Design a protein around this ligand. Sequence first.
Ligand code: PSJ
Ligand code: PSJ
Ligand code: PSJ
Ligand code: PSJ
Ligand code: MN
Ligand code: MN
Ligand code: MN
Ligand code: MN
Ligand code: MN
Ligand code: MN
Ligand code: MN
Ligand code: MN
Lengths: 421, 419, 430, 421
Amino acid sequence: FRIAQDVVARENDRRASALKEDYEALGANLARRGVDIEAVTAKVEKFFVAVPSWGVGTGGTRFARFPGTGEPRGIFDKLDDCAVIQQLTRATPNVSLHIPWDKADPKELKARGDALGLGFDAMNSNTFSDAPGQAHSYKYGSLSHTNAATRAQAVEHNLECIEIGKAIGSKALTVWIGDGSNFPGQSNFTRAFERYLSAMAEIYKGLPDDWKLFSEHKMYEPAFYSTVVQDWGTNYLIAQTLGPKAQCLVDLGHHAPNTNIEMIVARLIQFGKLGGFHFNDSKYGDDDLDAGAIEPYRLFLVFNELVDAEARGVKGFHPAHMIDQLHNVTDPIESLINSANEIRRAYAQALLVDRAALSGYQEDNDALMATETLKRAYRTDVEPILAEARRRTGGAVDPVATYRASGYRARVAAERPASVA
Amino acid sequence: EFRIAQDVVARENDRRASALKEDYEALGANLARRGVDIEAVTAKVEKFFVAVPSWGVGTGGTRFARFPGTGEPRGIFDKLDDCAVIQQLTRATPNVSLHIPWDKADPKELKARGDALGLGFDAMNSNTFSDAPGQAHSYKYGSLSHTNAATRAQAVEHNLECIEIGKAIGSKALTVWIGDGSNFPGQSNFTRAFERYLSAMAEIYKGLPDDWKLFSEHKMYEPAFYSTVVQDWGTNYLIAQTLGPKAQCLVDLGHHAPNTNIEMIVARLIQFGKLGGFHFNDSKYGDDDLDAGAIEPYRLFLVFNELVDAEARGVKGFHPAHMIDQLHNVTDPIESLINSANEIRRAYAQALLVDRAALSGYQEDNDALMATETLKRAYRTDVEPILAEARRRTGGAVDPVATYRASGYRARVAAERPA
Amino acid sequence: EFRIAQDVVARENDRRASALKEDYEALGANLARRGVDIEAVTAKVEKFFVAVPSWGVGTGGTRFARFPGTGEPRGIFDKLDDCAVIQQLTRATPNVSLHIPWDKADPKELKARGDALGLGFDAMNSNTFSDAPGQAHSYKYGSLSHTNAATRAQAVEHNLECIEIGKAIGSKALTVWIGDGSNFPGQSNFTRAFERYLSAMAEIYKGLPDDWKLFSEHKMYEPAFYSTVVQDWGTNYLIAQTLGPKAQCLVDLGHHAPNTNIEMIVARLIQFGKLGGFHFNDSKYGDDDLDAGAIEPYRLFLVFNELVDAEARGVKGFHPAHMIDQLHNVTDPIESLINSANEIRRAYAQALLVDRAALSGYQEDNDALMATETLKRAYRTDVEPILAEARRRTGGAVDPVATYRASGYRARVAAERPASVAGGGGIIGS
Amino acid sequence: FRIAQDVVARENDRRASALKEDYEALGANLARRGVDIEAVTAKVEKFFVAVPSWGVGTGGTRFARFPGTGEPRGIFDKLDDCAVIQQLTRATPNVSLHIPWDKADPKELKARGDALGLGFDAMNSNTFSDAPGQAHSYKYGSLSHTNAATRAQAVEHNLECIEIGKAIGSKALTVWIGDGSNFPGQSNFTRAFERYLSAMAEIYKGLPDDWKLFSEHKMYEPAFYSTVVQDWGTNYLIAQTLGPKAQCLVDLGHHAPNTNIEMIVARLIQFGKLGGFHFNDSKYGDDDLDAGAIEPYRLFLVFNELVDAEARGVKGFHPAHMIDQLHNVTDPIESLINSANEIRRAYAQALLVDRAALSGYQEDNDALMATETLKRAYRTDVEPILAEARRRTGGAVDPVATYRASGYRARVAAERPASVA
Ligand SMILES: O=C(CO)[C@H](O)[C@H](O)[C@H](O)CO
Ligand SMILES: O=C(CO)[C@H](O)[C@H](O)[C@H](O)CO
Ligand SMILES: O=C(CO)[C@H](O)[C@H](O)[C@H](O)CO
Ligand SMILES: O=C(CO)[C@H](O)[C@H](O)[C@H](O)CO
Ligand SMILES: [Mn+2]
Ligand SMILES: [Mn+2]
Ligand SMILES: [Mn+2]
Ligand SMILES: [Mn+2]
Ligand SMILES: [Mn+2]
Ligand SMILES: [Mn+2]
Ligand SMILES: [Mn+2]
Ligand SMILES: [Mn+2]
């Protein structure tokens, strides 16, 4: 137990009365609306989202990085920190690894995970930066580099990520590369994409029977003129071309200004290529901010599409849910805690939508009542449901408050040496 | 008079009275636990008013098509009758915003009708972005900033006429939004055009009553697709400052570049005393003029957070004009305006719930996470019980759209008005 | 038939012949030093054509207002007469794109008129984004994707009639752009709406002649302000791919999200054989429908660079349809279309000047700077002498707009046609 | 001479003939247009733009940095490379320094600049990153930080930049900070701006009589929710509030999508607050790409406003011009060379605009002819004028070609140790 149980007990007890009052009030209100709050809570306590190992330490921008105290010095410290998020929220049992950042002996990783009560989500490869001892630089590309030897090196790296993942329990590989160009003419758009397609086809061949291969699109950055996998259209072409095991991963902050992201989600589901999500919030570019901190409604609208998918009986639809954020000005553990909470919040509200009524308003083109039907769910304060879900599963009624009360940060600050060079 | 029968209102309120009582009491207990007196919030909410646009009462259209519904208002008088319904049911829209010459009519009559319906009039709106039949000079290439002196004079004269109409009905401000700009590089000399605009606005200001305000409204684009004279809040500030103390800037939410932090523009204008008022609506792409809060309700809340903070900081003489500027292309105009008015009160109400003392502490300590969570605790609060009770206590409807539909008002005016 | 007097064209050409000779010869010597035969370029340029929109010769407007100029064309016939002028002077717009029902008229008369004027017809354009007189079902909530079956059937039938009119006049394709979508979250079920659209398009597809094509045109927003069924090239690809071989995607330059790399979309559509054609225009904010290349000339060149690269390395009967889709609210429609057509040929000619061998080398080399400079060397080249000489050799004018004004054509049609009146644009009702 | 004169002479002679033909042809064409090419060339020779010291080294993104060979380490190495750009283009006589990146003994800096034939443009302060031993972190801001001591430290830093600048010949200080927030509520917009204005007032008082203080606005990054100096409106408020010596600096890539930047330029000029420019190109955000490599017409349109401003004889108009770019996939020296070249290209074309004709078409609302008047100048290939101006002032006809012919890159690569090589 990273967090003392007596502390979780104390803080939960301190807030029990208020929770009881709020939950019961919400329960009665929902009952009057024909909704069984217990049914919603039962589903909420089972919604899980993977935590990114690279989001447990303080992030930075191209301008600067401002680390806080007790920064994890490696993957093992990071797993320890992830154990806190899971213990308090009970919504993040799995961790997303990034190779070579989290490169370590597979058995050790697995041993630490089991010891902490954590599993492992999709593996993430890294061919957007050079590691020591590389025969080829990824400066001008990786899987789509004009140099065949460079593409071969990148492929091998991805295959290695699969080997690591199989050893620890992962069942998928997410591939995001920075490949693209910063000047018109630098790249032949089509040849670059063909090179990429050939490389991914090879990686596809090393995929176990029950594995998935996710390609993640991104409009720009690091490439500032064109990117090979720039949007969901190119992404669909990739998934369709590679095969059944290949699907598309949607990272919320990777779209052009004003893009209707929830529609992209609906389109990918309709064609069975919605592999998973990378949750975060943003206002300008790929800001990688705490989920829902900027546009909570958009997050709800995305979950509205996910729940509608179930409502329509979409077969074998099991998207992977993951947080992909950077925390530059907050305690990473606290931001990941509240971000996971926000995601469960959007999910819970999505479950409250009266889709029978909505179905009717859409059929009769009653736009005003249709939008009001969604709003009736989104406006509902489901915090009591999230808190009760946590209480029932061993978590904290108020996770960040309990986190601060434990003094975990000061503790790890004393155990961990700050990076000097 | 009462456009909506009172027995209907009473009936539809009693039908929901029990549920409301339960929700209001529960929220009240929750707010008490948070150190807030729900009664004090309701009191302020029932006092928050936003003006309804005359041009949003009838069905709107795009450059591609217009799909009118039944019972479309024939003119300003029908529109006032319909505005009376919005006010009767929401009790949040006692004033109507007129647009000339769309609403041209005998001022005395308009006032007589407003008085009979229990409606007042907000800022007048001039129109020199379109030509009227028998117009001597066309605004095709501009109006207040047109290169032709006679055309600028005509635009100025039209604005003065708007003021004369406003004085006859009780309006105390004039809002100036023009399409002036260019669609091609080189078409206009940016500086010269702005110089002409400033000179013309100077003449309008000269004719502005001393108990009136002059609001200029910036817009990034449309109808001008390359450059626009009053393109953003920066130019807008230069205008207000140049004209004088009676001139201020009006912020229309959908008139900003993609990803613009609009609440910051609001805060900046308040700091320098030039925030005249708002034109509320929502959008996702351009100046969509959609129902307020229907797309990004948190943004609306964040704008009101700046307004409330201004009061909390102790800003004096700050009374921004609140107006809705929307077009309803695929819904019953009355229903959209009803819920839009409600949404604005919703954001305002939530803004009132913000624990300013706690927020101040987190800001000073650079506790970004708790600062933002402090705003979220207010925003996440479902204040519908408060909005509904305020309505019920002031003669409105617990659920206005439901009551509106139960009344059969639309079918009624549909029979009274030509198809 | 010459809408513009031949002596006027001759006069205006002779007056600028001396200067053109000097510029053409200097550019010829420069290209020669660069290993390029100016005649080869001029020969290709003279053969590049782009269709003119019938709805473009009339003055356009916005939702706020419309400001018609003098001599506004009454109907399709007046518009065809005006299009004949653009073609006579630029020699780059022999085909006109029709829009139904705006230009509905006896096919035999249209066909007869086009021939007399030396004009053909490009793709037909259906209109189910507006209601017409006596229409049984309104398109307020959609057309091909409307929830009401009878409404979708009515829209399908309209499109089939467009195919019928086109078959009679010599058209070989149908372009389908609709406003279908929603203004509020929840109003539409994205998937169901798209399924209905696909099923409706399938019925229209069944009505296509063997040598016809069906072009679906995506647009991010407007008239729908929250979601649009055919919102981008991704959904557009799914459509074309689903319908069949005769279905392809049409790209309108101003229909993309801010900062989108449009030339890449073109390449992707080419790679997968679904590049149906283009709707050329320029913009800075949204679907501004401004004169092509008047705002971002380089972007137009880069789009043509992809086309020429494909045109170079011979591609699958690669013959995308080129059309101009613009609205002119502050200029003489005829003059803007003239210069817009010219700009399109300018970008094309410049793309022709790119040293493909050199470019390929720099790309394989990862020599970004030289690769981009290779494009710039072609783009920086002032090809106006080629464009002018191409027009002069084919019966056109050296300076089209100059000749147009010298002819007094506008004053002439102004006297023959009823005067127009300015007014609103539909933002509100009567 | 960083580049052997014999090399410059040989590469000039090699291209002298073609240059003569093109220059004469252009001279004849311009003559027919009532313009004397000699006059344009004379003006172009005198147009200068400052080269960034941080632009000669390879740039990178938050994802990775891919250094090239012969990466300059320290300001002395950087100055040596800047000298090559000036020698070959003759358009970058002055260098922009950034403190503390380029910290060194002022006397020694001046001596080096003099020896290399380089002057110094505006100084640049840095309170958007923490330096070793720093007493107060800038994690939550600097000049607008809530902590008084932190703001004072930031002020002191800027004052030191002024001291260094005065010793080396600089006459201005550019202030760009990352100050802002990543979360709504994190900052009180008004108070933060009040703190900034008060701090800037202190810096303003340390300004010599002949110095200027430039504030640089930016929409976002590093702050992803709000930025204190977010746009030109706030920037104007700052300059007007501070006084006559304070003006606004415009960095092309710092604006919202679709913003009409040339209008902002015109507005600042009209009110005497156009302090200077930070030239670069972009497509998505603050990409910092080579000037004009993405949107050359926009660059021309900006210069059209500058040339018009002089034509009108506006007073208080005397902006500084600087390049602020990052080169992640090209030889930094070649990019700066061609970027300085594009800037002169835009200036040259703006010089060709027939102002009289333009004025007439504007007054008569002939939009088509007015825009065509701009195009006639922009469509003109002024490369002959740029090449001749260089040839006449000791530069290279084709700078990048000569640079490559000289073998300079391999030279410094052999003198400088790479991290790994
Ligand atoms: O979103 C991403 C890049 O913008 C990818 O998912 C990365 O692998 C992840 O963010 C780690 O940098
Ligand atoms: O927002 C506006 C134009 O976009 C102005 O306020 C108008 O006067 C109003 O919308 C009426 O069209
Ligand atoms: O681009 C279009 C709508 O924005 C379609 O092509 C239309 O059919 C055309 O523009 C006519 O409005
Ligand atoms: O533009 C800037 C930051 O984006 C400032 O000018 C910086 O000081 C410069 O780029 C150095 O990073
Ligand atoms: Mn991601
Ligand atoms: Mn990302
Ligand atoms: Mn408005
Ligand atoms: Mn508007
Ligand atoms: Mn189109
Ligand atoms: Mn369009
Ligand atoms: Mn800068
Ligand atoms: Mn920058």
